């Protein structure tokens, strides 16, 4: 029992049963408008303090050199691609000569000017701004026009002057000249397209005056945002700390060095200006501004930080592209935290304490997840701060485990990753040697490359294939760490790996120079990863797909062998992935024999696969034999025709794929069905237009010499059309959604009906045409009817209703042999055993339009009768042939067979429902024999019990979960009640004199049932004695020996008992009433 609560699962309904073939892909996120800034001119005009100088020095002339190289090396450290110049109190000529060699030097590429204009007057309120002249005396002015003829073509303006504002104003119309006038002109044009403002004073203000503040306040904002924050704090929070802002200023630390207290404040404000302008604007602006080029996205981040400081001090800042004003965002008061704490800890010779910005702002993430709006794709505020922390080597791996759950989200996550610049980071930390990274890297990279195969470029040129082969080794043991729920550990490597191969031929060629088919090969052959198996075969599969070194590898470590091995593996779709490779090895070109002598072996070992259960490995087996039916095509038309003339007087292998092919063109599955035939009918138009006439005689010769009333349901998502004979797999696509769909997340009742009188016609149901068969709902009140022929009707017993009508899809002149409900606990599916051998079992059964059909199979190969164990998910089936086969719904394959020794056939089955292990066959010979699964084939035969009368056995029940009770009602009407154990039968009686026609047992109440030869059913108890005789409302009068009873049905709880006569389609349904028995 303690196997019995752990087995007990639900058998058809996985993702290969609601679908067999993928359904219905990504938004662009790559940043290809990729263009530097080259070149940057610095011009200063002077004569507060500046820069972090004191001009006024004796040495006056020094410190206006010194005001130029300090504004020169804050420049460069922002953007240290950017080359920068340097202009001191520069005249006109030198401004047009440099402004023109500047455009010169960066052909193409973003320029940098920079403006300072404290020496010189405020721009007019025209395009004019103020130079000094030649001479080095007066001030002469410049027009924008003349200057955007100096710096045409993409620019970057920093403008440290007041009124600013009217040089933005201005600025377009002076534009729209040269564009119509550059437009006049056959040379090539001059552009002046993409120009980019930004400027530290509106229109009409002043920059500020007082001291505690220096002149050059924007150009600090922009060049040294740190130290001006730090200054700007202790202006703003003088009774925080008590330090001058000159002191704040000289922070210990190095700005790129996160490790020291400069740095640290440094990379916060990265983080918190970064998802300040991630929150405040749109992606599009985002993406072009604060992503496009280091120069570029550092000033406009250095703007964020001005737009807050400058109106504390008059002019409000203005920028081209107009952002909104951003002043109070909330992420303000922890960089004033973030500063204040590490303010604090100035000390000098200790350990410094970092600020907590990362970790807090990660739980934030955490929490963002946990919850709300996540579900519903509200963008995450935190992730670039994630992204930030992906370098801390203390948080990162908190960080990647979080990367990791917001992905797992769905495909939306990762675009939504990707856009905002997490591949990178995802690339640098390959080359990390941690192993605590390792399942996280894996976790995360599988996802992306689902829902973008692209990176199969980049992972392969920065190496990724080594990373991944490494941890899929068979031999490497990977460090579990953190909430890593997943356990599905290397089937992700060999995914990846899977898709680095997948088109891209270099790939391929890259992996075969690893040990990655190795790895594969060896999971295919050692136990417990279904996945593992399933997707080295997939690897394997797009490894050698058109690469010829690979495939002769491939033979050299007998691939091969190796694959054909798992031809009846446990779990499906490995069976299908490895159809799959196989399919990808046909191919070699030059056709040796060695060549065709490994494809015919291959053809050979799959030819086994064409009997198994699971249409998805069928439909699989038929893609493959497409290709191999036109690599020798030749072959097939000469079998094809060998059984056409035999037909008529009606190399081996080819025949055999013929035959199951023609066998397969009947499948009851609709899509093999489908692929099978279009495989026969390719051939057959290539037979006949082949150099054979005689073949439309041949086939013309040939032709020569209550059904189908419902509609027949289909397997789900099947197409139509209105041929092209290699077929399209579907099956890797259908395998890669897994990485795209989340992976994280009563004795005394007893005695009541051994009295009463079943006499209460609880109900009458007119069905369409007469019943075969039915069967009833364990706890739904609905009852399965099949007709004679192909029909299929579900009625609500209370109320009567008609749930469904369905056609079976037998063939004509074969009638449905019985009804099983399986999974009656939570998803309950109709089974339905066909005479010509087919079992087929339907997912929505109590529903018209949305009935599907989840599997079917022919269970028995050259009517029929099946017993299902939901305990140990098997289909005994047995009809005509010497053997009881046993089919795990588990596995769709025909696990066992078991011979039943005697020559007549098998007309019944039981077995225990619970420990679902030993069966019992009724036969036609009278005979009873009872197996056990357990054993040996053909020493599974465990008692043999023979009917002296010889005569067949109508039905054998052993009603489990009431009692160790086995009935066996014969032809004639002796009904036997046996013991698995002993010789004879406990008990013996008759149940009518007249031919017994139906036999039901109750399964736990002690009551059973017979239906005799004329138009009466008996109920009995369990000792002989009979609790009614009844006579089913029909046409046909008192005991008219024209209607038979076709069924009987009990209740498998409910006390009641279901009754259709021949002649009648009348379902009659009686209960017990308050009667006794006289007894």
């Known amino acids: 029992i303690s196997q019995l609560a752990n087995n007990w699962y639900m058998y058809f309904t996985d993702k290969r049963h609601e679908t067999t073939g993928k359904p219905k892909e990504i938004q662009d996120w790559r940043m290809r408008d990729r263009l530097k800034t080259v070149s940057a001119a610095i011009a200063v005009c002077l004569n507060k303090l500046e820069a972090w100088q004191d001009p006024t020095i004796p040495p006056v002339s020094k410190a206006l050199e010194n005001i130029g190289k300090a504004l020169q090396s804050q420049y460069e450290t922002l953007a240290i691609r950017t080359r920068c110049k340097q202009y001191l109190d520069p005249s006109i000529e030198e401004t047009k000569k440099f402004c023109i060699s500047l455009r010169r030097n960066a052909k193409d590429e973003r320029v940098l000017f920079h403006y300072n204009g404290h020496g010189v007057p405020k721009p007019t309120a025209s395009g004019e701004i103020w130079v000094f002249n030649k001479n080095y005396t007066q001030y002469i002015p410049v027009s924008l026009y003349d200057l955007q003829q100096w710096l045409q073509a993409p620019t970057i303006f920093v403008w440290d002057c007041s009124e600013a504002g009217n040089i933005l104003k201005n600025y377009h119309k002076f534009v729209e000249r040269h564009e119509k006038e550059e437009e006049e002109q056959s040379y090539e044009k001059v552009n002046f397209r993409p120009y980019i403002h930004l400027a530290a004073c509106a229109s009409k203000e002043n920059l500020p005056t007082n001291p505690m503040l220096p002149a050059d306040l924007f150009t600090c904002c922009?060049?040294?945002?740190?130290?001006?924050?730090?200054?700007?704090?202790?202006?703003?929070?003088?009774?925080?700390?008590?330090?001058?802002?000159?002191?704040?200023?000289?922070?210990?630390?190095?700005?790129?060095?996160?490790?020291?207290?400069?740095?640290?404040?440094?990379?916060?404000?990265?983080?918190?200006?970064?998802?300040?302008?991630?929150?405040?604007?749109?992606?599009?602006?985002?993406?072009?501004?604060?992503?496009?080029?280091?120069?570029?996205?550092?000033?406009?981040?250095?703007?964020?930080?001005?737009?807050?400081?400058?109106?504390?001090?008059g002019c409000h800042p203005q920028s081209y592209p107009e952002l909104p004003d951003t002043r109070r965002h909330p992420l303000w008061e922890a960089w004033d935290h973030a500063v204040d704490m590490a303010l604090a800890q100035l000390p000098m010779l200790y350990d410094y304490v970092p600020s907590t910005f990362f970790t807090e702002q990660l739980t934030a993430f955490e929490i963002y997840l946990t919850r709300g709006d996540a579900a519903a794709q509200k963008p995450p505020e935190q992730l670039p701060v994630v992204l930030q922390v992906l370098l801390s080597q203390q948080h990162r791996l908190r960080a990647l485990i979080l990367l990791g759950r917001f992905l797992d989200l769905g495909p939306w996550a990762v675009q939504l990753a990707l856009s905002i610049g997490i591949f990178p980071y995802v690339l640098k930390l390959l080359q990390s040697a941690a192993q605590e990274l390792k399942p996280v890297m894996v976790f995360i990279w599988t996802r992306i490359l689902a829902v973008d195969i692209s990176c199969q470029q980049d992972l392969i040129k920065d190496n990724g294939y080594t990373y991944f082969s490494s941890i899929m080794r068979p031999n490497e043991t990977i460090p579990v760490v953190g909430l890593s729920v997943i356990d599905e550990h290397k089937a992700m490597c060999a995914f990846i790996l899977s898709m680095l191969c997948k088109g891209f031929k270099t790939g391929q060629v890259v992996c075969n120079s690893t040990e990655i088919m190795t790895s594969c090969l060896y999971h295919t052959?050692?136990?417990?990863?279904?996945?593992?198996?399933?997707w080295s075969c997939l690897c394997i599969s797009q490894l050698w797909k058109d690469f010829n070194e690979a495939k002769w590898r491939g033979i050299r470590e007998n691939a091969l062998q190796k694959l054909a091995a798992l031809a009846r593996d446990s779990c499906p779709e490995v069976r299908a992935a490895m159809i799959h490779a196989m399919t990808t090895f046909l191919g070699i070109p030059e056709v040796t024999d060695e060549v065709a002598r490994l494809e015919?072996?291959?053809?050979?070992?799959?030819?086994?696969?064409?009997?198994?259960?699971?249409?998805?490995?069928?439909?699989?087996?038929?893609?493959?034999?497409?290709?191999?039916?036109?690599?020798?095509?030749?072959?097939?038309?000469?079998?094809?025709?060998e059984q056409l003339l035999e037909e008529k007087e009606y190399d081996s292998l080819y025949a055999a794929i013929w035959k199951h092919l023609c066998i397969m063109s009947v499948d009851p599955h609709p899509e093999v069905q489908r692929d099978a035939t279009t495989i026969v009918d390719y051939i057959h138009h290539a037979l006949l237009h082949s150099p054979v006439g005689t073949q439309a005689q041949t086939l013309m010769d040939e032709i020569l010499r209550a059904y189908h009333v419902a509609p027949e349901p289909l397997s789900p998502g099947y197409q139509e059309r209105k041929p092209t004979l290699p077929l399209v797999s579907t099956f890797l696509e259908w395998s890669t959604e897994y990485f795209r769909e989340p992976q994280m997340k009563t004795q005394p009742q007893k005695l009541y009906a051994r009295t009463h009188r079943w006499n209460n016609q609880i109900g009458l149901i007119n069905n369409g045409t007469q019943p075969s068969k039915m069967t009833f709902h364990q706890f739904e009140n609905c009852v399965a009817v099949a007709d004679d022929g192909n029909t299929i009707t579900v009625w609500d017993w209370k109320t009567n209703a008609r749930l469904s009508r369905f056609s079976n899809g037998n063939p004509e002149g074969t009638k449905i042999s019985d009804l099983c409900f399986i999974n009656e606990d939570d998803q309950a599916l109709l089974m339905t055993g066909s005479s010509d051998g087919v079992i087929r079992i339907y997912n929505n059964y109590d529903s018209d339009e949305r009935v599907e059909l989840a599997s079917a199979w022919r269970a028995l190969t050259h009517g029929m009768v099946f017993e299902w164990l939901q305990v140990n998910g098997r289909v005994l089936v047995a009809g005509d042939e010497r053997v009881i086969r046993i089919w795990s719904a588990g596995q769709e394959i025909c696990t066992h067979e078991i011979p039943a020794r005697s020559g007549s056939c098998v007309t019944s089955l039981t077995s225990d429902q619970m420990t679902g292990n030993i069966f019992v066959a009724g036969f036609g010979d009278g005979a009873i024999r009872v197996f056990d699964s357990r054993l040996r084939p053909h020493e599974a035969m465990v008692r043999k019990w023979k009917d002296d009368a010889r005569q067949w056995v109508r039905s054998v029940h052993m009603q489990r979960g009431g009692q160790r009770e086995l009935l066996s009602a014969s032809r004639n009407g002796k009904i036997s009640l046996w013991d698995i154990r002993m010789d004879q039968p406990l008990k013996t009686f008759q149940s009518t004199k007249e031919i017994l026609r139906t036999a039901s047992t109750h399964e736990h109440l002690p009551v059973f049932a017979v239906g005799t030869s004329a138009h009466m059913v008996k109920v009995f108890d369990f000792d002989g004695n009979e609790l009614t005789r009844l006579e089913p409302y029909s046409n046909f009068l008192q005991g008219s020996k024209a209607s038979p009873i076709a069924t009987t049905a009990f209740h498998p709880h409910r006390m009641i008992l279901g009754c259709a006569s021949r002649g009648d389609n009348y379902i009659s349904l009686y209960s017990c009433s308050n009667e006794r028995v006289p007894n």
């Open 525 to 534: 052959e050692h136990p417990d990863n279904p996945l593992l198996r399933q």
């Open 222 to 313: 922009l060049t040294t945002p740190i130290e001006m924050a730090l200054w700007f704090f202790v202006l703003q929070n003088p009774l925080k700390t008590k330090l001058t802002p000159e002191r704040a200023r000289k922070l210990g630390g190095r700005l790129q060095e996160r490790r020291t207290p400069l740095g640290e404040l440094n990379w916060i404000f990265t983080a918190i200006t970064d998802t300040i302008a991630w929150t405040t604007l749109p992606r599009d602006l985002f993406r072009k501004f604060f992503r496009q080029d280091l120069m570029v996205a550092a000033l406009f981040r250095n703007f964020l930080l001005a737009q807050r400081i400058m109106p504390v001090y």
């Open 600 to 641: 015919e072996g291959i053809a050979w070992a799959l030819l086994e696969m064409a009997t198994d259960g699971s249409p998805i490995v069928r439909k699989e087996l038929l893609v493959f034999w497409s290709v191999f039916v036109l690599r020798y095509e030749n072959k097939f038309l000469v079998a094809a025709y």
